[PDB]
Enzyme design. Structure first.
Site, short mmCIF file in Angstrom:
data_model
loop_
_atom_site.label_atom_id
_atom_site.label_comp_id
_atom_site.label_asym_id
_atom_site.label_seq_id
_atom_site.Cartn_x
_atom_site.Cartn_y
_atom_site.Cartn_z
N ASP A 119 0.84 -1.19 0.00
CA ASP A 119 0.00 0.00 0.00
C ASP A 119 0.88 1.25 0.00
OD1 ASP A 119 -1.59 -2.19 0.47
OD2 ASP A 119 -2.27 -1.55 2.45
N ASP A 121 0.50 4.07 1.78
CA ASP A 121 0.75 4.74 3.04
C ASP A 121 2.20 4.52 3.47
OD1 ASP A 121 0.23 2.06 3.33
OD2 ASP A 121 -0.67 2.25 5.32
N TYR A 380 -19.18 -4.74 24.33
CA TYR A 380 -19.92 -4.75 25.59
C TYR A 380 -19.83 -3.43 26.34
CZ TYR A 380 -19.02 -9.73 24.78
OH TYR A 380 -18.90 -10.98 24.22
#
Ligand SMILES: [Mg+2]
Ligand SMILES: [Mg+2]
Ligand SMILES: [Mg+2]
Ligand SMILES: [Mg+2]
Ligand SMILES: [Mg+2]
Lengths: 772, 773
Positions: A119, A121, A380
């Site tokens: 990539d 980046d 949660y």
DNA sequence: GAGCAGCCGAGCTGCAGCTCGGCTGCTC
DNA sequence: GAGCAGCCGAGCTGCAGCTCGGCTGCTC
DNA sequence: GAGCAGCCGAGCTGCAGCTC
DNA sequence: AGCTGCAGCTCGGCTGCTC
């Protein structure tokens, strides 16, 4: 060869092996994109699987330079067993006992070359591609010279025009960021950032593979490469500390033209630009700024939290809040990392990183015994802005005046906050980065309040002394380590503070009972380390953990007649006694006070005082910048409200004949002396500079009269409006009253806000940072 | 004992083994919460500790042991013997499969006194996971249940906090709460919290739960009805679930709920009838789609959330971000990972994909036909974007105000169901199981649906009168053939079943069969691997090479010398399957399971695609009436409001309003002058108001519609704007009464108009590979 | 003689690796 | 008495796995 | 210091603006 | 009809007083 996540080229290892390319993508998602492009009969020779293979790099690959030792050059057992590098060696038929100097040896490989499809980046082309080049340079430098290591260049940012088919493409975030500030307007532009290869859409992947061969670049070796590979990936971090203190030196236009015309890139230039840019970015990501003690991710999380919660502080699940932060603050990285930083930002247990968490954690957020690693999953547990602390520590009025980061051409989080208290030295931090480590131990809150109040309060009896001390960088008042939530002892021996646990000996029952551990020592890891010592376990028959949620009680049952042998085989120094030695109940508060400057780069402090002294001018100046702008807008709002009052005092007077449109109604108000006002800017100044406020506020229009509701013509409403003007003129005198203060503008309101932050800290501390 | 995710009690397996509890939590997050409460010196002895309590993870849904046994004795299937979760439980407890545990001495050879299930209170936890645990013990050691060895810890699912009261109100089922919320005047002064897992309770709530730990541990008991009920819910015969899940759960009587709570004992048969049945009913509503719009609850939330998220700016957003938005604003009570997958699947568009008309535009790599959409990028790379032109035509925004809505946590969530312009349930591909029923549908041809629906609606078309005369007698007059889109093969009907066929080409010289198309919804890579898995078929094949384009098929099957003659011999040439179509398995059968979910709840077994379309027609027909009827009511009221405003500014300078002191006095004079009292927010923004609520509330009065008038409305251009607005309103209003008086039913002409609009969008999407660029 | 696998929507979770320096084990 | 690996933290890169449920296919 | 009320402040819908 | 960038609207939050 059947390597995991490997799909062969059809001609791999055959007669035409040296015609084959091995594409190395970052991971499965990028692999699936390459497969999408490798399988077109509409590209009419683009490449295909006839001669192209794929293999996964599994994210960042292992740094072989730090895992070899030369006797010959031996690969350590971690490097020998790396499944990712094994698969590349097998797939290519590489030989570790061959230099590949001759053309005949190079033809015994199963592919002609390896093409890194990382990539764009900085993580991809800088670190991962950098680490891949260092692997081949370490073992087969001849393969680099003869062009066996190539790369595929893809854009990182694409900007599309609304009235144009072909976009403008960028390969570095700096390329875009500079080009965007010098653009008149981007209302007719949408910026897209491509976080991975799998982010390109179908039409872009077709374009990228039609022109596939014109985007493959080949790596070359020069004389500078050998030392540069050692600086960036060798064992000596000192060499990184020397290189990473300066910015990236850009390529000359003559340099970029040669590279693109022949499509060859010397390794040394790749290291100086791509890899170095990552390591610079890596420092800004992992080492916090000394002004507010925050990293880029944590500042995004706070700025995103303020937006999400300051209007409506209803709690939200962590993974939902992470989505908000990543959306509104333009986070270009993995969702799971950002969710971890959110959870860790809200943990509040004895020894946790944050003495003053930015959020209230609602749910199971981790215990001291497991280093906060026993928190619930992000689905949660929920977070909630610690608003009373945040509003006092990060004044909302000040956030309008900070420098801001712009991502993809849009405003993101501030470059730094300037809190009311020096947060960088009020909390616990410890993590590494490129070149530098970072570790700080929280200072005592009372010592911090004493230092800042002396600086600000003219009536303090050490006010004039401290200013004379800051100038010469001496120290007059103590900055001792904090003891809050710590039941042990802190002692100074020369230049170092030490933390001590507490123990109880029952000579009868033969039990040593640990009742507190050293600072930031997790319980479970401590007990496991005392079982990993054969030396110490000769005298222990059992260890039992009776610790509370957040208090320590470890029962160490000793073996018959050992207490006398312990004092012998463990010496008693004037600074530590034998049992504190036996049970390792003492650590040293070693600091690495390396931080990040406002305008970028590392900065090595020598004491906690230096950080506090450096932060004071920024907080001092912001109180001036704030009051100066409240003065400018109040001046402007009184002009707007008095103009409105005078209009409705003459309402039936000015409207003396019926007018056609809104531009004719502006004729009448202009001729009658009403000022044209930009009401939107006067009510909402937002990020406007004072020079821009004065310039644009008075060049406006008359909506502020035309949008006036009939109910504002009422007498009771009018007196409400005119008493509002009294409010503002009483305020404006008070504001310039405060600007005239000693030792500097706003000293008295700074003191007011220090008391507010203290009151909030006390309330949070009294409620286990729950504020319920 | 060294088992993964196991933390022993200190007295476990020792002299005091039978004094120890084994707490069984759902997973690590729940485990870490139990450790938080088991380690207090501020509570206790009132609470338990690690002196006598141990914990172990159930790893989510546990294995259903009933479907892994065969009677030879009773042999355990070898997959069940190797289940690491159940293996660890037997190890920790010292359980023996050749032991009856009938006597107090045998039960005392176990390493714990009991097992306490600490499952979450969602239906998944107490209904499914706890049910499967009870079925495990009942299958192998029923004596252990009788003697109270199997217990559970009861925790709340929903808590409601009042802003004056310190103690909250707690609920144990989402339905019990939902009813309690409808019977409340207002919960504006209340915070509702849903606890999807144990780890969701805060520190003060976990402390409270741990004083009363012993008062909240319930013990299971066996009845005579238990054996049959365990077989119905967890047995091998799905028929018994189809029988049981045809009715809602029958609630416990107050006599039953009082005995259970006074002694803290729960009969297994009662737990199965209430908790497990409530889950299995919810499981059906989650995975079996509604026949009106073809969506599940998750996909309807995803669409409703998409409309809200994107109606401001269809700027693309990454999947995990959009998933967070949907879970927040649409009240999603489940795992973040599931919702992110359903978002991805909703946006896949490849030949054979589930959706012929996705609601989103996938931007990035969203999966290919070759891997069954399993090669899509991770949710952090790819982005979604509302297919707005399709969505606005298929789900008219005016209708969404008038649908019934589900309310979650006391707040309005997604619609109960959409009523699309076309019968979406039969226009797409679906295939997945649920409890009791399977679900499988094969998309009907769009043109057959447009022809059938237009006949029903268009008064001037042959034959309107025929089709209605057929629905009454439950006949079918027009075909509903399977779709051919993105399909190069042919479809053939043989008896009750349609079959899809791939295509092949033979080059006798080079001896290569080249597969040029596969059957419907058959992924390429998995297909090739199934013919690489056949020794029967690979005898004649020397190599298989895949040259297929992205979404067209080209597989080169190179044969061994002189096998082509053995193929026609060593296989079979049926009048329905050529030897090679048989040899290369280039034929599937379009088995359908037209099981759906009814409005306002429950399953419904359809037998043909016509019945689904016939059932959807009345809902869409009537909704066009509800729509036009309410637009008439709102038009009337907006006309009253704007004419009153015109009269005000025509008399503004007469009754000048800067004349009076207060705001309520200015309304008195306006009242005295005949201006009507109007509830302006409701006429301007009716939103979800029914006409009966609209008519009742419209004249609640305020006079803010005059007091909020801006000075610019005194301008000539502004007032003329108002009368041209009023004109257009009266016109529309006249047009509305035409549409209400239409044949065969109100709004027939706009239904036809909108069928054309959705078709144009479908055509536009098809012409752009559903990208719309 | 069952078992394996497939789908969707759900319930739980698990690893590889980079960076730095202090410590502690280990090893020789 | 002096060498290595091991560990750890934050913030990053990239992935993996066990289940239920219904029916139909395949191989075995 | 906690109710109660009024007003402030910016997050995020509403509604022009420019279409097509 | 139909985005979508601005401006502007909303209401939960502050901020004042009083009890
Ligand atoms: Mg990347
Ligand atoms: Mg950036
Ligand atoms: Mg007048
Ligand atoms: Mg659960
Ligand atoms: Mg519900």
């Amino acid at each position: 060869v059947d390597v995991d996540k490997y799909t062969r080229a059809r001609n791999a290892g055959g007669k035409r092996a040296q015609d084959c390319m091995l594409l190395a993508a970052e991971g499965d998602s990028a692999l699936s994109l390459l497969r999408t492009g490798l399988t077109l009969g509409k590209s009419n020779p683009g490449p295909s699987f006839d001669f192209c293979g794929m293999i996964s790099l599994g994210g960042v690959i292992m740094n072989a330079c730090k895992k070899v030792t030369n006797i010959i050059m031996v690969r350590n057992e971690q490097l020998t067993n790396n499944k990712v590098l094994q698969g590349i060696v097998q797939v290519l038929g590489l030989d570790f006992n061959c230099h590949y100097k001759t053309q005949e040896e190079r033809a015994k490989l199963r592919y002609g070359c390896i093409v890194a499809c990382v990539d764009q980046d900085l993580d991809g082309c800088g670190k991962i591609l950098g680490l891949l080049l260092a692997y081949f340079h370490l073992f087969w430098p001849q393969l680099i010279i003869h062009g066996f290591v190539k790369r595929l260049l893809t854009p990182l940012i694409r900007v599309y025009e609304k009235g144009k088919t072909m976009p403008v493409e960028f390969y570095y975030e700096q390329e875009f960021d500079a080009w965007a500030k010098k653009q008149t307007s981007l209302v007719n532009h949408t910026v897209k950032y491509y976080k991975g290869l799998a982010a390109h859409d179908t039409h872009e992947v077709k374009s990228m593979f039609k022109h596939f061969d014109n985007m493959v670049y080949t790596f070359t070796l020069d004389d500078s490469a050998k030392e540069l590979f050692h600086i960036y990936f060798g064992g000596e971090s000192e060499l990184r500390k020397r290189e990473l203190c300066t910015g990236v030196v850009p390529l000359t236009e003559t340099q970029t033209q040669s590279i693109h015309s022949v499509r060859r890139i010397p390794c040394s230039l790749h290291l100086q630009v791509d890899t170095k840019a990552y390591k610079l970015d890596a420092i800004e990501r992992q080492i916090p700024n000394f002004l507010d003690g925050m990293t880029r991710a944590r500042r995004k999380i706070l700025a995103g939290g303020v937006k999400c919660f300051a209007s409506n502080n209803r709690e939200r699940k962590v993974f939902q809040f992470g989505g908000y932060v990543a959306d509104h603050m333009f986070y270009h990285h993995g969702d799971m990392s950002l969710n971890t930083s959110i959870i860790k930002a809200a943990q509040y247990y004895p020894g946790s990183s944050h003495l003053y968490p930015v959020f209230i954690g609602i749910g199971s957020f981790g215990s001291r015994h497991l280093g906060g690693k026993d928190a619930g999953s992000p689905r949660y547990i929920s977070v909630q802005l610690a608003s009373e602390f945040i509003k006092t520590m990060f004044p909302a009025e000040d956030s309008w005046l900070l420098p801001y980061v712009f991502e993809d051409g849009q405003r993101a989080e501030p470059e730094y906050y300037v809190p009311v208290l020096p947060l960088a030295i009020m909390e616990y931090g410890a993590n590494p980065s490129e070149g530098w480590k970072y570790t700080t131990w929280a200072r005592q809150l009372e010592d911090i309040l004493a230092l800042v109040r002396a600086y600000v309060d003219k009536d303090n009896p050490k006010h004039e002394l401290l200013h004379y001390a800051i100038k010469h960088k001496i120290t007059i008042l103590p900055l001792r380590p904090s003891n809050y939530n710590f039941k042990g002892h802190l002692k100074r021996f020369g230049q170092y503070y030490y933390s001590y646990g507490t123990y109880d000996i029952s000579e009868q029952r033969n039990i040593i009972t640990i009742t507190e551990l050293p600072l930031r020592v997790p319980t479970v890891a401590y007990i496991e380390s005392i079982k990993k010592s054969s030396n110490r376990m000769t005298f222990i028959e059992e260890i039992i953990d009776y610790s509370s949620s957040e208090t320590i009680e470890i029962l160490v049952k000793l073996k018959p007649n050992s207490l006398n042998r312990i004092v012998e085989e463990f010496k008693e120094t004037e600074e530590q006694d034998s049992i504190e030695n036996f049970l390792r109940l003492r650590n040293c508060l070693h600091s690495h006070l390396n931080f990040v400057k406002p305008k970028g780069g590392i900065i090595e402090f020598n004491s906690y005082y230096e950080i506090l002294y450096a932060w004071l001018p920024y907080r001092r100046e912001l109180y001036q910048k704030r009051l100066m702008r409240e003065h400018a807008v109040l001046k402007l709002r009184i002009i707007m409200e008095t103009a409105i009052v005078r209009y409705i005092n003459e309402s039936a007077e000015l409207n003396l004949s019926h007018y056609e449109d809104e531009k004719e109604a502006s004729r009448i108000l202009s001729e009658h002396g009403f000022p044209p006002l930009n009401h939107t800017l006067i009510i909402s100044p937002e990020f406007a500079s004072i020079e821009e406020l004065n310039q644009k506020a008075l060049q406006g229009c008359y909506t502020y009269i035309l949008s006036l509701q009939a109910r504002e013509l009422l007498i009771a409403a009018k007196t409400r409006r005119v008493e509002k003007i009294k409010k503002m003129q009483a305020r404006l005198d008070k504001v310039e009253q405060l600007l005239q203060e000693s030792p500097f503008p706003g000293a008295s309101v700074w003191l007011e806000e220090i008391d507010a932050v203290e009151k909030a800290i006390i309330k949070g501390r009294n409620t286990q940072w729950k504020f319920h």
